[PDB]
């Protein structure tokens, strides 16, 4: 819910692409 | 079982109704959905209702009247053990777009493009109407599109997630079914508009062209990842329109998959064009529902003498009310073919 937590998750998933 | 119920449409008029062969079609805390026979088959949604407040779904349905919206036939209240239940008796339609799609996928077959056109025009027309009545559906997905197997009539149903989006009122972000959820919702926007419905409708269209969901995320974040692998990383300016709380992060830059390489060979170019005009990160860049009805992809439906693949008349597509012709009048010349 915290944008930093969500964005960091998103960044980690995007990096794996 | 027999009950006295109120007519869904018109003034408050009572009617004794009798129904049998009651079978659960779906459970859940969102209510219980039964099917029964009156002698016509009907659907009944039983939901717990706080007696102190109106039922939101009931008020929306009593206010919509359109050939592409499911009809509320009757409604009645029930108790058990201040425990109050509202019962919505709805017109029963044999099939859904989801059921039809799965029949085609199971048979390893493609849905004929004419039925994709016929169905999606009706969805976009229904969204134009409900949006003009101030209603955002918020759960557009194949399972909520009723279709008659023979006439190809499509009706939008399940207004249990629906809401009037009032400018300045925050709304719940975790809404819609995930594969059809607009990216601004995944980014937690609370100030979203009824264009989330158009995003969802674009996902249905793509799904009918692909044979599978376009964005099959297995979680909130993986849903954004599935969107990004097709559209590419949203720009910072697109993120700013979705949720400005995310504009300052460094997201990895993933190239877009070319739209013409997303769909199978021989997918019509105008179908791909329409998808790309609906599936826009920035909510205000998405086509209006009426704009989608006027798209070149639906030109076949406006051509004099076009008929259903089972060689029956097209269902009602051009019988616009005065309200509908007032939504975006500059599209009226396109929406109404010259032959009227
Ligand atoms: C009976 C309920 C139903 C429905 C309810 C909620 C969403 C979509 C459809 C529904 C069907 C046929 C079905 C897909 C086999 C089962 C089913 O859930 N047709 C309907 N017409 N009116 C409401 C319905
Ligand atoms: Ca995935």
């Amino acid at each position: 819910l915290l944008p930093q937590k969500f964005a960091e998750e998103l960044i980690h998933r995007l990096e794996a692409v | 079982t027999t009950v006295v119920a109120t007519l869904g449409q018109g003034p408050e008029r009572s009617q004794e109704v009798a129904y049998t062969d009651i079978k659960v079609i779906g459970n859940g805390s969102f209510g219980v959905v039964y099917q029964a026979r009156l002698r016509e088959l009907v659907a009944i949604k039983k939901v717990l209702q706080d007696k102190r407040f109106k039922n939101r779904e009931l008020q929306i349905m009593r206010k919509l009247d359109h050939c592409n919206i499911v009809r509320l036939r009757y409604f009645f209240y029930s108790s058990g053990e201040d425990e109050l239940y509202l019962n919505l008796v709805l017109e029963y339609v044999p099939e859904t777009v989801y059921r039809v799609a799965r029949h085609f996928t199971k048979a390893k077959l493609t849905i004929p493009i004419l039925y994709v056109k016929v169905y999606m025009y009706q969805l976009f027309r229904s969204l134009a109407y409900i949006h003009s009545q101030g209603v955002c559906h918020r759960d557009i997905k194949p399972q909520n599109l009723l279709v008659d197997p023979d006439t190809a009539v499509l009706k939008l149903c399940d207004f249990g997630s629906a809401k009037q989006l009032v400018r300045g009122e925050p709304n719940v972000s975790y809404i819609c079914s995930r594969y059809y959820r607009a990216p601004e919702l995944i980014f937690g926007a609370t100030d979203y508009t009824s264009s989330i419905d158009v995003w969802s409708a674009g996902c249905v269209l793509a799904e009918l062209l692909l044979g599978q969901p376009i964005f099959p995320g297995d979680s909130g974040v993986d849903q954004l990842v599935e969107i990004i692998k097709v559209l590419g990383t949203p720009t910072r300016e697109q993120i700013r329109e979705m949720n400005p709380n995310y504009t300052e992060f460094k997201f990895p830059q993933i190239k877009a998959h070319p739209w013409t390489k997303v769909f199978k060979s021989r997918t019509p170019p105008e179908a791909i064009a329409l998808c790309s005009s609906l599936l826009e990160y920035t909510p205000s860049s998405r086509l209006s529902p009426l704009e989608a009805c006027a798209h070149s992809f639906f030109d076949e439906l406006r051509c004099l003498g076009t008929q259903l693949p089972n060689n029956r008349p097209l269902p009602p597509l051009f019988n616009f009310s005065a309200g509908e012709l007032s939504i975006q009048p500059s599209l009226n010349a396109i929406l109404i073919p010259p032959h009227r």
Side-chain angles (χ1 to χ4, degrees), chain A residues 3 6-7 9-17, chain B residues 1-8 10-11 14-15 17-21 24-36 38 40-61 63-80 82-107 109-166 168-254 256-260 262-263 265 267-339:
Chain A
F6 176 78
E9 197 177 352
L10 182 53
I11 297 171
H12 282 337
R13 297 272 218 150
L14 286 177
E15 268 160 73
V17 172
Chain B
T1 88
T2 165
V3 64
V4 86
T6 309
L7 254 70
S14 303
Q15 166 81 58
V17 316
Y19 65 87
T20 195
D21 306 291
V24 155
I25 299 263
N27 231 347
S29 52
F30 285 152
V32 178
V33 172
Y34 310 94
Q35 180 213 274
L38 286 188
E40 326 212 73
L41 283 155
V42 288
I44 297 154
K45 188 192 194 179
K46 175 166 318 159
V47 306
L48 202 161
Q49 179 56 45
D50 192 329
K51 64 102 163 173
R52 299 170 301 175
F53 303 94
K54 302 188 300 286
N55 180 273
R56 260 182 291 250
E57 191 176 355
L58 180 64
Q59 303 297 129
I60 282 165
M61 311 268 261
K63 148 171 52 152
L64 313 172
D65 166 33
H66 194 272
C67 64
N68 288 130
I69 312 297
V70 66
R71 298 257 146 221
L72 178 76
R73 284 233 56 80
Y74 325 98
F75 66 101
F76 59 94
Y77 293 91
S78 303
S79 293
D82 299 311
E83 214 184 337
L84 176 69
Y85 294 89
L86 169 69
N87 297 276
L88 304 157
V89 171
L90 292 124
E91 143 192 36
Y92 180 95
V93 175
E95 293 281 1
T96 59
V97 162
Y98 174 73
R99 280 209 19 199
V100 174
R102 250 185 101 151
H103 290 304
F104 274 89
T105 64
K106 186 168 170 198
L109 280 154
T110 300
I111 313 186
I113 204 67
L114 186 42
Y115 284 105
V116 175
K117 288 182 190 213
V118 168
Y119 292 166
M120 296 286 105
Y121 180 94
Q122 291 174 88
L123 174 51
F124 287 125
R125 186 183 172 192
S126 83
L127 294 182
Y129 172 69
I130 66 168
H131 289 183
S132 78
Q133 290 304 291
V135 174
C136 180
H137 185 275
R138 305 202 301 176
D139 197 13
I140 301 294
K141 60 171 161 183
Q143 305 92 312
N144 283 345
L145 314 173
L146 307 171
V147 284
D148 184 281
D150 286 304
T151 68
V153 161
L154 184 143
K155 305 189 174 304
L156 189 59
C157 65
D158 183 29
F159 287 77
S161 300
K163 169 115 214 310
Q164 299 212 164
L165 300 185
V166 193
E169 175 182 351
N171 284 291
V172 165
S173 292
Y174 192 78
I175 196 80
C176 308
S177 171
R178 183 196 304 134
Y179 306 153
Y180 313 91
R181 181 179 300 143
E184 68 266 26
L185 303 165
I186 306 160
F187 272 118
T190 58
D191 63 359
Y192 55 91
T193 67
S194 62
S195 56
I196 63 161
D197 281 342
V198 168
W199 174 275
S200 298
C203 293
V204 181
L205 167 62
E207 181 163 347
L208 295 188
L209 307 166
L210 282 175
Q212 56 180 285
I214 175 78
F215 306 130
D218 64 10
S219 76
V221 73
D222 180 62
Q223 183 66 36
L224 219 38
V225 170
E226 292 301 315
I227 296 168
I228 285 174
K229 281 150 73 173
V230 171
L231 303 188
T233 305
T235 63
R236 287 179 58 243
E237 288 319 303
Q238 281 164 318
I239 290 166
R240 188 193 307 282
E241 271 284 74
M242 299 198 281
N243 185 343
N245 290 324
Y246 287 84
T247 65
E248 305 311 321
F249 300 102
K250 291 312 119 203
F251 295 102
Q253 296 300 303
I254 284 58
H257 212 269
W259 265 120
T260 67
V262 176
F263 293 97
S265 75
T267 318
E270 277 326 272
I272 303 180
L274 176 47
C275 284
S276 80
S277 293
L278 304 164
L279 295 181
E280 288 274 6
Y281 279 120
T282 297
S284 60
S285 293
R286 300 168 196 158
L287 288 188
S288 74
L290 266 205
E291 275 165 359
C293 287
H295 197 281
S296 281
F297 176 62
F298 298 109
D299 284 357
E300 190 178 349
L301 308 190
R302 290 179 278 259
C303 281
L304 200 39
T306 288
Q307 324 213 325
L308 231 49
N310 67 11
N311 229 26
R312 318 169 100 270
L314 294 178
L317 301 167
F318 311 121
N319 58 335
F320 298 123
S321 74
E324 287 176 289
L325 298 177
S326 100
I327 299 171
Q328 198 170 347
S330 58
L331 304 162
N332 281 351
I334 281 138
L335 293 168
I336 305 172
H339 69 90

